[PDB]
Amino acid sequence: ARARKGALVQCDPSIKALILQIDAKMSDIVLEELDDTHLLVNPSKVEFVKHELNRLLSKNIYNPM
Amino acid sequence: PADFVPDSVSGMFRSHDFSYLRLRPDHASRPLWISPSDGRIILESFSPLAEQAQDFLVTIAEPISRPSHIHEYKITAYSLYAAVSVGLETDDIISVLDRLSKVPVAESIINFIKGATISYGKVKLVIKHNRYFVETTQADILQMLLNDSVIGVHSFEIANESVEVVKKRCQEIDYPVLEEYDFRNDHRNPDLDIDLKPSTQIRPYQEKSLSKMFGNGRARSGIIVLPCGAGKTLVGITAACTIKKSVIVLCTSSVSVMQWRQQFLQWCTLQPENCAVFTSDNKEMFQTESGLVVSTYSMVANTRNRSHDSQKVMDFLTGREWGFIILDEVHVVPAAMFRRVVSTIAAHAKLGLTATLVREDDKIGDLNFLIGPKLYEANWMELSQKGHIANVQCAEVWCPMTAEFYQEYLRETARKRMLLYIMNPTKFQACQFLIQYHERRGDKIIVFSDNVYALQEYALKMGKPFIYGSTPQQERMNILQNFQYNDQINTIFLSKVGDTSIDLPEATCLIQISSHYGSRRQEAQRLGRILRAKRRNDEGFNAFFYSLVSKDTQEMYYSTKRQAFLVDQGYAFKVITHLHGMENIPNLAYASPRERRELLQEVLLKNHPLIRKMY
């Protein structure tokens, strides 16, 4: 019955697997894992996670010049 | 500009605001919009007087894109070179463009027309007794070339190997080289009595391509691209019958050489005694004064120590002045020593026939220097809507990667990642469901995957034959004959063997499991193996092309890169992220989590005549 300051996020298992390597790279990203689709990202970095997620998925997108 | 006041909405245009061009009062009949920035031409097909402008643009410009309504053409130097060569004078082009355009023709575009059109036909490359001579009608053009002097009415002999350097250097200068064969007035080379059989009919687009090639009465060296099954071989036969000189044909495979010999002896009145084949088994040449010889790029460009008979045949090819060369699959000509086949063979006219005129490197832009300007583009939608080729329904199935597979995908190197995103179980389920659905429809299906291990695993899991490099030739023939005739074998798994030139039965469905990175050529070659189906005469018939890709992987990037060429031809790849029948199919490959875990750990496990007897 304790309270923490975190944000629950919904994702497919691919994005779930992606953000655990962000935890392995930078320590203060995720606090603990809940399910195969729900994660608990610290709210002070969530947009930063967004700021890398489109950067992390940019390698999967072909951009013509 | 024309003192046009800049609006505040013109801020984000990087000097592309063409509003200073005053709109004509009679503009609505005129279907063109000329852009002064790059010579790009915008054509509206739906307006009247569109085709009477469409022929003009396909004569004077290169089409960037041809969608349904608005077509986009490019005015380039090489298109103008072919425009003036077929008899269009400089003032006629400017007058017609002025008459057929809404916006006025800008002075920069007009000056580009004058600059590219003039100083053409000055320098010419002629061949006299197997020796290359560059010739100019004006004297001082010889004296202005002092940089790339490879000298060994006004003409000087150049070396045979240095002809490409001369063509590049003269293209850099404002004097492009004219490469036209006046076969009507050429009498040193002995003629051939080769002519098409009267029973052979030629389609109008082939006639248009050959009219681009033989417009002025002289054979012009260049490139013709047609879809697979649209009859590029027949275009080669007709070009040989038009020139009526000695013909040398280069191919990529020995089976292609056999097919070209068969097509020559069938469509045209050429005796087999005038036909010669330069392959490993057959090396006998024709004994007549003129004829046809067909061979492969590899044997002609073999730098290794070739046999004595092959050396004698190569000496015969080099010492004979050929009137015509047909380079099939000209996209492999820009290779290292496949480039040299135009130097080792003295040929007056060079026609490069292809279907996939793209390479991932820039050397595909060197074929104008090697063979000649891009003579004809086939409109693949125009041929599909007339039933000449199949109406393919291109699609891209998004297969999501599972949780345990995607974790291993990120903690791995790229070479193992390549194997790992192919073998995701959702791609197995999607391929199995598509195979079952299109087999119930009664379709001949080819499943392409460049990974040999993935090909074998998919075929063993789904109980279908597989063909790859190490398969014996007789087994390949037996499997293909069962695919063509036996109704219990409607699906064949093919590796990169099927991508290159091998004979295949007609198929209407293709499933691309894997691919060789971002190869657009391989993608279009795979699409070309379902474009010549027999059922094209059937109303409502459509072929199918599936590119099964793993979601959120680098396979998406390479898949988009491969599809970048086909969207230029006009094909639209509709994404399929859901298949109706996933949950209700009887057997799902790797449905249970333990089976998926076993598959994952299997994929991870992949990576003195007397003393002679005593010895």
Q: CB B553 to CB A60 under 8 A?
A: yes
Q: CB A14 to CB B551 under 8 A?
A: yes
Please name the amino acid found at residue B128.
K
CA–CA separation, B182 and B217 (whole Å):
7
Distance of alpha carbon B194 from the chain centroid: 27
Burial class of residue A17 (count of CB atoms within 10 Å of its CB; 0-12, 13-18, 19+) = buried
Q: Which residue of B has its CA nearest to A54?
A: B552
Q: CB B556 to CB A21 under 8 A?
A: no
Kindly provide the resolution of this structure in angstroms, with one decimal.
3.1
- If you ran DSSP here, which 8-state letter would residue A58 be given? G
CA–CA separation, B385 and B383 (whole Å):
6
Q: CB A17 to CB B407 under 8 A?
A: yes
Please name the amino acid found at residue B255.
V
Partners of A20 on chain B (C-beta within 8 Å) are 407
CA–CA separation, B527 and B69 (whole Å):
25
Mutate to test the interface with A, among B408, B420, B519, B557 (most CBs of A within 10 A): B557
CA–CA separation, B93 and B356 (whole Å):
31
Torsion of CA B272, B276, B280, B284, to 10 degrees: 90
Closest among B522, B523, B508, B514 to B563, alpha carbons compared: B523
- Crossing angle for the helix pair B77-85 and B90-99, to the nearest 10 degrees: 110
Partners of B557 on chain A (C-beta within 8 Å) are 59-62
Q: Residues B283, B313: contact at Cβ < 8 Å?
A: yes
Q: CB A17 to CB B406 under 8 A?
A: yes
Mutate to test the interface with A, among B410, B418, B515, B596 (most CBs of A within 10 A): B410
SS3 assignment, position B608: coil
Q: Which residues of A touch B (CB under 8 A)?
A: 12-18, 20-21, 36, 57, 59-62, 64
SS3 assignment, position A53: helix
Q: Residues B344, B300: contact at Cβ < 8 Å?
A: yes
Mutate to test the interface with B, among A11, A14, A33, A52 (most CBs of B within 10 A): A14
- If you ran DSSP here, which 8-state letter would residue B208 be given? H
Closest among B57, B38, B34 to B379, alpha carbons compared: B57
Total H helices, total E strands in chain B:
23, 23
Q: Residues B243, B320: contact at Cβ < 8 Å?
A: no
Distance of alpha carbon A29 from the chain centroid: 7
The DSSP bridge pattern shows strands B491-494 and B445-448 to be: parallel
Burial class of residue B53 (count of CB atoms within 10 Å of its CB; 0-12, 13-18, 19+) = buried
DSSP bridge partners of B351: B222, B326
**Percent helix / strand / coil, chain B, rounded to 5:** 40, 20, 40
DSSP bridge partners of B395: B546, B574
Size of interface A-B (CB pairs under 8 A): 44
Partners of B400 on chain A (C-beta within 8 Å) are 12-14
The DSSP bridge pattern shows strands B32-34 and B40-44 to be: antiparallel
Which of A20, A57, A62 is the closest to B552 by Cβ?
A57
CA–CA separation, B194 and B210 (whole Å):
17
Q: Which residue of A has its CA nearest to B559?
A: A62
Which of A12, A13, A60 is the closest to B557 by Cβ?
A60
Partners of B573 on chain A (C-beta within 8 Å) are none
CA–CA separation, B350 and B437 (whole Å):
47
H/E element holding B95? Answer: helix B90-99
